Structure formats: structure tokens, C-alpha cells
Enzyme design. Structure first.
Site, PDB file in Angstrom:
ATOM      1  N   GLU A  56      73.918 -38.298  84.840  1.00 38.89           N
ATOM      2  CA  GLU A  56      75.143 -38.737  85.501  1.00 38.89           C
ATOM      3  C   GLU A  56      74.866 -39.845  86.510  1.00 38.89           C
ATOM      4  O   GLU A  56      75.697 -40.742  86.696  1.00 38.89           O
ATOM      5  CB  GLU A  56      75.818 -37.543  86.178  1.00 38.89           C
ATOM      6  CG  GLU A  56      76.434 -36.553  85.193  1.00 38.89           C
ATOM      7  CD  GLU A  56      76.986 -35.302  85.864  1.00 38.89           C
ATOM      8  OE1 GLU A  56      76.837 -35.169  87.094  1.00 38.89           O
ATOM      9  OE2 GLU A  56      77.591 -34.464  85.164  1.00 38.89           O
ATOM     10  N   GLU A  58      78.124 -27.431  92.156  1.00 38.70           N
ATOM     11  CA  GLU A  58      79.273 -27.686  91.297  1.00 38.70           C
ATOM     12  C   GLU A  58      78.878 -27.589  89.824  1.00 38.70           C
ATOM     13  O   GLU A  58      79.656 -27.102  88.994  1.00 38.70           O
ATOM     14  CB  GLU A  58      79.878 -29.054  91.627  1.00 38.70           C
ATOM     15  CG  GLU A  58      81.234 -29.328  90.950  1.00 38.70           C
ATOM     16  CD  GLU A  58      81.761 -30.735  91.223  1.00 38.70           C
ATOM     17  OE1 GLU A  58      81.474 -31.281  92.310  1.00 38.70           O
ATOM     18  OE2 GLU A  58      82.475 -31.293  90.362  1.00 38.70           O
ATOM     19  N   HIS A  59      77.669 -28.044  89.481  1.00 43.22           N
ATOM     20  CA  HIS A  59      77.199 -27.931  88.107  1.00 43.22           C
ATOM     21  C   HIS A  59      76.890 -26.498  87.698  1.00 43.22           C
ATOM     22  O   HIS A  59      76.792 -26.229  86.496  1.00 43.22           O
ATOM     23  CB  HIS A  59      75.942 -28.774  87.882  1.00 43.22           C
ATOM     24  CG  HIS A  59      76.212 -30.227  87.663  1.00 43.22           C
ATOM     25  ND1 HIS A  59      76.936 -30.995  88.547  1.00 43.22           N
ATOM     26  CD2 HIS A  59      75.862 -31.050  86.646  1.00 43.22           C
ATOM     27  CE1 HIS A  59      77.012 -32.232  88.089  1.00 43.22           C
ATOM     28  NE2 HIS A  59      76.370 -32.292  86.936  1.00 43.22           N
TER      29      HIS A  59
END
Ligand SMILES: CCCCCCCCCCCCCCCCCC(=O)OC[C@H](COP(=O)([O-])OCC(O)COP(=O)([O-])OC[C@@H](COC(=O)CCCCCCCCCCCCCCCCC)OC(=O)CCCCCCCCCCCCCCCCC)OC(=O)CCCCCCCCCCCCCCCCC
Ligand SMILES: CCCCCC(=O)OC[C@H](COP(=O)([O-])OCCN)OC(=O)CCCCC
Lengths: 34, 105, 446, 425, 34, 55
Positions: free
Chosen positions: C137, C60-61
């Protein structure tokens, strides 16, 4: 006793013009003790 | 409507003086029994009426301690008795009955 | 005039088509200048092993960082230039990439999605830069007690199984996930019969199918000889995890029993029961007059700052329960009132409150599918879980079937005398013992 | 074929008493009705500050037609919703429900807005909610800054906070709530909007129950832009700062130029975890600032004024660098360094953003209610894109010129040891 | 639930540059409900 | 000489005080309004400071 001087519990009320003179500030100082 | 009405009111004034709470300076609403409906109505009273209620009850308990009554001049006159609490209590009761009617469906 | 029932017939049918490679293409046409279109993939951390548990989140990153055709920020400039918005998310079972754009830009939006899901260039220089980002994160997520306590609930409830894993993965995995781990993940899961090109807005289903055969025909629909991933059932475990940390100002508690899954018809009745219990926040205006006994009691007695009921669904399993946040001297009362309502609904559910839960769910269903993006999500996700789009008229039929008896029977099946999973975080000295919690799941009077 | 029917177009009516009704029958399963009122915090004065906040929290208090218990249980019985949204200019009483229950929730809405009792004890019990509600909002640092930014910018009205000043918590009286409703919740200040409602019904309701006279004139006293700075030293991890100038009233052509300038400078992100390549503010700061930060153009337009500028978040030591880099980037635009592909992309972001803001019923209803009070009309989307297309590049440059040369207002919170004053910019 | 929107219990921490984008304000609104 | 011979530390007066000008307003609804209005005048020990004292 703790002091705040600047002149050169519900505390109280000042209503008349005679009891306001002297209240206007005139350089704050803070003092603490035992 | 004076004939029949005043006789009923005459018997009510008789009972009022017979009850004798006026002899201690109290009003009718000062003597009501405090249930949950009455505690809420008292809570809703404005400042002045609450403070007046407190002092009258305090003055009556002081008299009851001394087994005394006020002088006759200071008795609560039947015509001057104000039902200051009744309108608040009526609303409190009306609100509770609404809750109860919703709890039935 | 028009009635509620008649309005449900006016909802357009969701058209569905499947390409030759197996890619499913679904759309609900509206009369809008904008639209939302995206690809929903049947991939998530439940498919990931302990080695590669952080790969999908890592991908996703990297999905929006460059491709073979549009390297670097070239993709980022095309989306921004036409005023469109590109977004994505990953769960334990589903991954999604979708674009919000003008309806006229649907041909380009579909092209970009195909370029992302097929030709993602996972450059080594970019992989290393996203490494430190994810680790940061993880530090941020540690400060969200809500996100922490819900990961704890999964960790103990599904202990020993893939669902116990977090979506982001452990700290150690992010520092050794290689490019081969990510490409192996992609080439193994991003197959056409597990993807759904969903769209919603002003658009003809014909053009979406044309763009699908145009930009997704170049996709491998032929699985490996015996490398087709199959989800094993995940053992639920009655258990408890308590992270005592008195330095935090409020306790977070999550409790749940095992639910049935996405495709079980009992979810409708379970959602009605959760609507009766509802949710609460200290900023609600109702307070003492709220219908839910848990909510009114919590407001009047200040038992908590918030609570929410939930029914989290997975394949053939799920987490059914509630979560709340409260002062350290209120955990026991909240647990007591919470469990009392579960037992009350199991044994003594009345008809009027059930009509309340039905009405709340009707409003919750209609109010949620309000906009191109929520409808596009409901299209893509429903085709993965249900294998079809369930029209609102069908949901209304299932809700109308529910009466008080259905709630008492359905709730007793999942709540009564069942072992819950408990997750506690914060000042939780007053959190009741597990035996006492377990004893709260039945009534001696019943 | 799952082609949908032909969409019905909105209907609109101005009654002679000033009230505005606007309905749209979308044949949706749910209905939405909102009463928009020119009663925002600007219409408070120094003697009744916070009265509109407490009013915003009092929608479930007892009315003449519905008890507090009934409002909460009647709406929840049919799964409906009641909300009160408030800006510096407007209060918006909105109600949501399924089609068949609109009569029920309309009656509640009318009682809340036209017949509240403000019972002394109910009001007293609500006063502590001001402290809870304010505290929840003010744990976003953005809420502090923007509230201080308006207090520093204006001498009155728009200087007023959306949240009650602490000294007024417990001091707002039922009389002040009564007085506030009586002279602000009037026909000439109201707009009744309804989605999934027939126009005859709303027109019937408006003429029957919303014919309220008396009160005050429209817009009250004019907002006098001042300029100034408010600085809040609190040692937060990051410094939040906003720097603005007076820009333009909403509805004017100059306001579209500011809106286009906002999307040239960079308003918000379009790509998840993207570098914001086409964001001219972000790249300007990103050049000489390698630590984490955020920067965004700020655009706030009102009936009689506006504020334009930028908002920065940065490390405390890099606050001045980020601010000066952001301000210079606006200067280069005022100096004429603005290409046509830049403004065309900004129009695309703006035009696309507007359409996306009205695809939900909630966002559509707020726009129609806002237009009804601001403009007294409904402007369809195609005409809005037309007005956006009409923005020339010279209009955008001139707006940037107006910001650079205009007297500034600033607000900042954090460790401000390296956050400059206005005269240091 | 109470809302504060301005973009056009320990809450959480924002550390990296990716998680800061979207936070800068871009005219405050306050909303309350049941 | 015995106990107050402390060295190290910082120089005298630290950083110079930069007069700015500005206004801070505190709305609190007190019964009376207190207000002070000033300008930069003179450092103590200068002859100009006596003139301010006499003023
Ligand atoms: C001798 C006479 C017995 C008196 C008790 C009779 C039951 C009673 O009063 O009803 C309440 C009790 C409440 O049970 P419930 O349905 O679980 O209600 C939960 C409430 O929320 C209440 O839930 P809770 O979370 O507040 O507590 C659950 C409660 C459940 O237990 C009780 O409430 C029983 C109280 C103890 C009775 C004394 C022992 C004999 O647990 C206890 O208090 C058990 C601790 C006893 C330890 C004693 C040893 C020292 O009802 C019954 O036990 C009814 C069944 C009676 C069976 C008797 C067989 C003949
Ligand atoms: C005539 C009997 C009256 C009932 C007394 C009784 O059984 O006490 C309740 C507990 C078991 O209930 P619980 O602790 O699971 O809580 C269940 C709540 N849902 O039993 C015990 O272990 C307590 C020991 C009592 C021995 C005297």
C-alpha cells in the site's frame, strides 16, 4: 518515399464511378527508403 | 406616414452618399470601429458573412491605396445596405450589460 | 408550506447517554429500515511516538481478521451473510469502525463492534501477512501525487512534532512493529471515556444504551495511575518542501497557513471565505462564468486542471489553505491569482459574495448530512472534538452572524502577513521562491 | 423524546399526455428536483452519434429565459447545483438547493430542458470539452471494457457509447442538438420528480411548462442482441475482461432471479480488506490463482434487454485461468449445486443493498425517476422486498442455465496474449 | 465534478490483492455538473 | 559464406497461424463504406492456391 500497396494534407476526393475503379484492394505491403 | 418620414430618410440617404464608404463597395457595418464588443460580434458571424466582410474590406483598402473608387454601378446602394453585424453586436452588448448589473449587487 | 428555518427545527435531537465505565452512547433516530452504527475512538498517529507511528494503521489491517470469539473469517461471514457492510478509517486524530446494516440487525451489529474493539486476536501469523500488504500500500500511495503532497505539507508545517507523522507510518516501522507494540497501543488508547458508540437510522436510543451496557460494560474505564495520554500542542513552522520530479506530467502544490482548531468559533467564517474561493475541475461546466475569480480566471486561461480550498482542523491547530494541479508553466500564475484572492478577501470582501459563501456552506452542510452513515460520523466525531452534537440550527446561527466585515477580520487574522507552509511535487521549476510566496501574503498598497 | 414525526408517503400522478409527476414532502432543509427523460444514447443512430454526450455537457449554455452567465451565477448565488446524469436509456436533469430557492432553480431547470437555444458559437466552444470529458472517464479501464462490451453485444441502440466517438468531436451540430431535444424531450418520455416540493407545485409546473407534443414514440427501435467480442491490446499492467449473455429486461420477474444470482456469485465487497468468504466467484478463482486478482458478477438490465455475467481483473498470464475458473463456477450453479442458505444470504445482501441505496435523497430521487420511466409507477420498498422474496432457487439456477447456454459477448483490454476468445471457453 | 460509475495526471497504481477488491465492474453511468 | 553465416535464433515459421473468423467494424463517417469479406483459402505454393488465383 513511404509506400503502402494492397491492390493485388487533404489527399483528394473520389466522386464518380470511373475514378473508383482500381481502388478496391486485391495483401498489404509496407516499404520505406531514403 | 410618407410626408415626415421620407424627409428624415432623405437626409439620411444624403449623408450616406456624403460619407462615401459606399463608393468603395463597403457597407456601414464594415466601417465600425473594432472595440471588444465588435471583435466578439465579428467572431460570432457565420462563415459566409465573415468571408464577405473580409473581401469587401480588402477591396476597399486596395482602392484606398490607389486613391480610386468603384464605378458608380458598383456603389453600395443605400436601400441595399444590410446591417448584418448589428444583431450580433446588440446581443454582445446586452450580455456585457448583464454582467455589469450583476457586478453591482 | 414550510421554510428553510422551520425545516431546521424538524431535525430530531441527537440523544446522548454515558455508561458507568465512561463510554458515551449517542444516536439520532430517523424513520429508516437501515442504520449505521460504529465506535469512534480518540486515537490516531498524533498520539503515536516515532517508534510505534504505524501501529494504529496496522491495527486497522487486523481489526476485521479475527477475534477470540469469532476466529478467522467467522466475523467476515456473519457481516456478509446478513447483507451488512463493515468499514473503518484512521486519521491523525480519530479512528472509527462502523457497520451499515438493517435496523433489525442492530443488536448483532453492536455485538460485533464490541467484539472487535475489545477481543481483537492479533495472531502472529496474521500480523506477518498484513506486513507485506501495508508495504504494498505504501508503494501504491507513492503514485498518488495528491496523497503525497498533503503528507509533505504536514511533514514541513508541523516539523518536529507528532502531527508531522503520516498515518501509515514509515516503511521501517512496518517491518519491526511487534505484537507487543500493537497490544500496548490498544490497551493504552482504547479506553471507554475516549470511545463513542454512535448510531443513526431507525432505532430507539433506549435499545442502543441497553446494547451498550450489555456488550461494552466489560471495558476498562479506570485509567493507569499517570499514563493518561495528553496531546501536546504542535508547533507550526513556516517552511517549504519541494520534491522536484520532472518525469511527472503535472505539478501538485499545497500551500497553507496555521488554522485555530476544531472548537474555535472562527472556523465558520473561514469556511465561508474558502467557499467564496471555492474549487475547480477541468470537467466543470461553468468555466468562464463561474463566480469565484480564481475559478473563472483558471478556466479562461487554462491555469490549472483543478484546485481545492481546505480548512483541516486538529486540536488547537490546523492547516488553512489550498491545493492545485497544473502544467509546469502555470504554477506561478496560479500562485499569483490564489494569493491575490486571499489578500482581496482580507482587505476588500464585499457583502454579496459573502452571502454566496454563506449559501454554499448551508447547502454543503445539509447535503452532506444526507444518509445514515454521514450522520453517524458527524455524531461520533463531534462528540470527540466538540464534546456535543451541534444542531444544524446552531450552525445556521453562526453562519448568519457572518457578514463582509467578519470575513475581512477573520481572514486577516490567519492569512495576512503570516508565514505559509508550502509543499511542491512534480515539475516545479516555476514554483515561486519562498520569499516571493511570503511577499505574496501582504499588499504594499494596503 | 427525539422521536421524529410521522413520515409523509409519496404522491404520484400520470397526466393524460404521458408525463409522470412524483413528489415527496420530507420537510428536509434542502429540496431536490429532477427531470428524467427517455433520451439516453440508445436513441442516437449512426448519423448523429455523440449528440447526447454534447447535450449532457451543454446544460449551462444560453436558453431563451436565462443567459449562460445567469444560469451559472444565479445557481451559485443561492449555493445550488445543476447536474446531468446519463445512462444508455435515460438523461436525468437534477437541481439541488435550499427550500426557499426552489422557484429560482425550477425556472433554470425548465429553461435548460425546454428552451435551449444551442447558439452556434457557444456550441463550437464546447466541442473540445467532449475530448476532456471522455479522456477523464476513460482513465478507468472499466469504462473501456463496458463500452466495448455493449458495442460487441448489440447491433444497435444499446451498442451506442455514452461518450462521443472521436470522429464526431467537432462535428456535432446545433441542428442535431435541436432535433435531439425536439423528438426525445417530450411529455410521454418525461418524469418530473421532486423531494421537498409540494405536489400541487410540480403538477402546476408540469401542466404549464412540460406539455410538449410531437417527436417520436417510446423506446424507438428495439435492441437486437448479437453476441461477439472486442479485444483491445494496450499492454496495461493488468487484464480487464467481461463475459456476459443476454439475461432479462428490467421489471420482469426473471430479472430478480438474475439480481439474486449476482449476489450468490458475488457482486461487491462488504468488509474492508476482507477475503470475501461468502463470494462464490472469488473463492472459486482463489483456489487455483494465488496472484492478485478481482472478480465480480455483472448485472445490467434495460427496458428491452439485459446483460449478465462476470468481470475479471488479473495478471495478463493468469487471465485465462481466472476467466475459466469463474465460468466453471457459474456452470456448477447451472448444474443445480445451489443450497438454500446461499440464496437466502444473497436475498439478504440484495434486500439490504436496495434499502441502503435509497437512504440518501440523491439515491432516492434517481430510483423514483428510474421507476417512473421504466415502470410508469412507484413501487415502495416493502413490495420490492416481497418481489425479492418470491425468487425461488430454481429461478436462480435457471438464470445461470440461461447464461451458460446463451450466446456470449466479451470485451477485454490489456496484454491479451493469454486471454481466451469466446470459442476457447 | 465529472463522474463515471459502473460498480453495480497519473491516477494511481493498484498492486496488492486487497486494493483490487471493489474494482471489478458490476452498467455505466455518466454525470456532469457545474 | 563470409558474412551471412549467422547461427542461433529460432526455427522456421515460428508458431502456426490459427484461423479464427470474426468481424471488426470501424464507425468513422467517411464518405464511402469500405468492406472486405473473406474465408480461409490456401497456403501459397499449393495447387489449391492457383485455383484461388484463377477464381
Ligand atoms: C519610483 C517609483 C515607484 C513605482 C512603484 C509604486 C508602487 C506601484 O506602482 O504600485 C504597485 C505596488 C503593488 O503592491 P501590492 O499591494 O503588493 O500589489 C501586489 C500586486 O499583486 C503585484 O504583485 P507581484 O507578485 O506581481 O509583484 C510584487 C511587486 C511589488 O512591488 C512593486 O510592484 C513595486 C515596483 C517597483 C518600483 C521601482 C522601485 C522604486 O514586486 C516587485 O515587482 C518588486 C521588485 C522590484 C525590484 C527593483 C530592483 C531592481 O503597490 C505599491 O507598492 C503601493 C505602495 C507604494 C509605496 C511607495 C512609498 C511612497
Ligand atoms: C518608492 C518605493 C516604491 C516601492 C518599491 C518597492 O518597495 O519594491 C517592492 C519590494 C518589496 O515588496 P516585495 O518584494 O515584498 O513584494 C510585495 C508584493 N506583495 O522592495 C524591494 O526590495 C525592491 C527594491 C526596490 C529598490 C528601488
Amino acid at each position: 518515399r513511404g509506400v503502402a500497396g494492397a491492390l493485388r494534407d487533404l489527399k483528394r476526393s473520389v466522386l464518380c464511378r470511373e475514378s473508383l475503379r482500381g481502388q478496391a484492394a486485391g495483401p498489404l505491403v509496407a516499404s520505406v527508403s531514403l | 406616414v410618407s410626408a415626415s418620414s421620407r424627409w428624415l430618410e432623405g437626409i439620411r440617404k444624403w449623408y450616406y452618399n456624403a460619407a462615401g464608404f459606399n463608393k468603395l463597395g463597403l457597407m456601414r457595418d464594415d466601417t465600425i470601429h473594432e472595440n471588444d464588443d465588435v471583435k466578439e460580434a465579428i467572431r460570432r458571424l457565420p462563415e459566409n458573412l465573415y468571408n464577405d466582410r473580409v473581401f469587401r474590406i480588402k477591396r476597399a483598402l486596395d482602392l484606398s491605396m490607389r486613391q480610386q473608387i468603384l464605378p458608380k454601378e458598383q456603389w453600395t446602394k443605400y436601400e441595399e445596405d444590410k446591417s448584418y453585424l448589428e444583431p450580433y453586436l446588440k446581443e454582445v452588448i446586452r450580455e456585457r450589460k448583464e454582467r455589469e448589473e450583476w457586478a453591482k449587487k | 408550506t414550510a421554510t428553510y428555518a422551520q425545516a431546521l427545527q424538524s431535525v430530531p435531537e441527537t440523544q446522548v447517554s454515558q455508561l458507568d465505565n465512561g463510554l458515551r452512547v449517542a444516536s439520532e433516530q430517523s424513520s429508516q429500515p437501515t442504520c449505521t452504527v460504529g465506535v469512534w475512538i480518540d486515537a490516531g498517529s498524533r498520539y503515536e511516538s516515532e517508534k510505534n507511528n504505524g501501529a494504529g494503521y496496522f491495527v486497522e489491517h487486523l481489526a476485521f481478521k479475527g477475534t477470540k470469539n469469532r476466529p478467522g473469517n467467522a466475523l467476515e461471514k456473519e457481516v456478509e451473510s446478513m447483507g451488512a457492510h463493515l468499514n473503518a478509517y484512521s486519521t491523525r486524530e480519530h479512528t472509527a469502525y462502523y457497520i451499515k446494516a438493517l435496523s433489525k440487525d442492530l443488536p448483532k451489529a453492536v455485538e460485533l463492534l464490541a467484539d472487535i474493539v475489545q477481543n481483537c486476536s492479533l495472531e502472529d501469523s496474521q500480523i506477518e501477512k498484513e506486513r507485506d500488504v501495508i508495504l504494498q500500500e505504501l508503494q501504491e500511495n507513492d503514485t498518488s501525487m495528491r496523497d503525497v503532497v498533503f503528507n509533505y505539507l504536514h511533514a514541513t508545517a508541523f516539523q518536529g512534532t507528532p502531527l508531522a507523522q503520516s498515518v501509515e507510518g514509515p516503511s521501517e516501522n512496518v517491518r519491526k512493529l511487534s505484537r507487543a507494540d500493537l497490544t500496548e497501543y490498544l490497551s493504552r488508547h482504547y479506553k471507554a471515556p475516549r470511545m463513542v458508540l454512535a448510531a443513526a437510522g431507525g432505532l430507539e436510543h433506549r435499545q442502543l444504551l441497553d446494547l451498550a451496557q450489555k456488550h461494552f460494560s466489560g471495558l476498562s474505564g479506570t485509567y493507569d495511575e499517570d499514563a493518561v495520554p495528553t496531546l501536546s500542542p504542535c508547533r507550526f513552522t513556516g517552511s517549504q518542501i519541494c520534491h522536484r520530479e520532472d518525469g511527472l506530467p503535472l505539478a501538485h502544490v499545497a500551500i497553507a497557513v496555521e488554522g485555530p482548531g476544531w472548537a474555535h468559533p472562527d472556523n465558520v467564517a473561514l469556511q465561508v471565505a474558502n467557499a467564496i474561493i471555492g474549487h475547480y475541475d477541468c470537467t466543470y461546466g461553468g468555466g468562464a462564468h463561474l463566480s469565484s475569480p480564481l475559478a473563472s480566471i483558471a478556466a479562461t486561461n487554462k491555469l490549472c486542471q483543478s484546485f481545492q480550498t481546505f480548512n483541516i482542523c486538529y486540536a488547537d491547530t490546523g492547516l488553512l489553505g489550498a491545493h492545485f494541479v497544473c502544467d509546469h508553466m502555470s504554477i506561478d500564475d496560479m500562485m499569483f491569482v490564489l494569493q491575490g484572492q486571499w489578500m482581496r478577501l482580507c482587505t476588500s470582501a464585499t457583502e454579496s459574495e459573502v452571502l454566496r459563501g454563506k449559501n454554499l456552506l448551508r447547502n454543503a452542510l445539509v447535503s452532506h448530512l444526507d444518509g445514515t452513515t454521514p450522520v453517524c460520523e458527524d455524531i461520533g466525531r463531534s462528540l470527540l472534538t466538540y464534546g456535543r452534537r451541534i444542531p444544524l440550527a446552531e450552525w445556521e446561527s453562526r453562519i448568519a452572524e457572518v457578514d463582509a466585515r467578519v470575513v475581512r477580520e477573520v481572514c486577516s487574522k490567519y492569512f495576512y502577513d503570516q508565514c505559509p507552509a508550502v509543499a511542491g511535487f512534480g515539475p516545479i521549476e516555476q514554483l515561486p521562491d519562498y520569499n516571493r510566496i511570503r511577499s505574496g501574503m501582504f499588499w504594499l498598497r494596503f | 423524546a427525539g422521536v421524529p414525526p410521522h413520515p409523509q408517503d409519496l404522491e404520484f400522478t400520470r397526466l393524460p399526455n404521458g408525463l409522470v409527476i412524483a413528489s415527496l414532502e420530507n420537510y428536509a432543509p434542502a429540496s431536490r428536483i429532477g427531470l428524467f427523460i427517455k433520451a439516453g444514447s440508445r436513441y442516437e443512430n449512426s448519423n448523429n452519434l455523440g449528440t447526447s454526450h454534447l447535450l449532457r455537457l451543454a446544460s449551462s449554455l444560453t436558453t431563451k429565459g436565462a443567459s449562460s452567465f445567469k444560469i451559472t451565477r444565479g445557481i451559485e448565488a443561492v449555493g445550488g447545483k445543476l447536474s446531468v446524469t446519463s445512462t444508455r436509456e435515460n438523461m436525468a436533469y437534477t437541481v439541488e438547493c435550499l427550500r426557499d430557492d426552489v422557484d429560482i432553480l425550477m425556472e433554470f431547470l425548465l429553461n435548460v430542458t425546454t428552451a435551449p437555444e444551442f447558439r452556434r458559437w457557444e456550441v463550437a466552444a464546447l466541442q473540445p470539452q467532449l475530448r476532456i470529458d471522455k479522456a477523464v472517464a476513460l482513465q478507468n479501464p472499466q469504462a473501456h471494457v463496458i463500452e466495448n462490451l455493449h458495442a460487441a453485444a448489440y447491433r444497435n441502440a444499446l451498442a451506442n457509447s455514452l461518450y462521443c466517438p472521436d470522429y464526431r468531436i467537432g462535428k456535432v451540430t446545433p441542428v442535431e442538438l435541436h432535433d435531439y431535444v425536439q423528438n426525445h424531450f417530450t411529455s410521454a418520455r418525461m418524469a418530473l420528480i421532486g423531494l421537498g416540493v409540494s405536489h400541487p407545485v410540480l403538477k402546476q409546473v408540469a401542466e404549464q411548462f412540460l406539455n410538449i407534443r410531437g417527436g417520436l414514440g417510446l423506446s424507438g427501435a428495439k435492441a437486437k442482441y448479437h453476441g461477439g467480442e472486442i479485444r483491445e491490446q494496450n499492454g496495461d499492467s493488468l487484464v480487464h475482461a467481461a463475459l456476459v449473455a443476454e439475461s432479462a429486461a428490467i421489471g420482469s420477474a426473471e430479472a430478480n432471479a438474475f439480481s439474486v444470482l449476482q449476489h450468490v456469485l458475488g457482486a461487491g465487497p462488504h468488509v474492508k480488506r476482507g477475503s470475501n468468504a461468502t463470494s462464490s466467484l472469488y473463492q472459486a478463482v482463489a483456489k487455483g490463482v494465488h496472484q492478485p486478482f478481482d472478480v465480480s458478477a455483472f448485472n445490467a438490465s434495460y427496458s428491452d434487454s439485459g446483460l449478465f455475467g462476470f468481470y475479471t481483473i488479473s495478471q495478463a498470464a493468469s487471465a485465462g485461468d481466472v476467466i475459466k475458473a469463474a465460468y466453471n463456477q457459474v456452470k456448477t450453479i447451472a448444474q443445480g449445486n445451489l443450497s438454500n442458505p446461499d440464496v437466502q444470504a444473497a436475498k439478504n445482501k440484495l434486500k439490504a443493498g436496495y434499502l441502503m441505496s435509497v437512504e440518501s435523497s440523491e439515491g432516492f430521487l434517481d430510483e423514483v425517476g428510474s421507476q417512473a420511466l421504466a415502470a410508469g409507477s412507484y413501487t415502495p420498498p416493502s413490495t420490492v422486498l416481497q418481489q425479492i422474496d418470491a425468487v425461488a432457487d430454481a429461478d436462480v439456477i435457471n438464470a445461470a442455465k440461461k447464461f451458460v447456454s446463451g450466446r456470449k459477448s466479451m470485451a477485454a483490454s490489456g496484454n491479451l496474449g493469454h486471454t481466451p476468445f469466446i470459442d476457447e471457453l
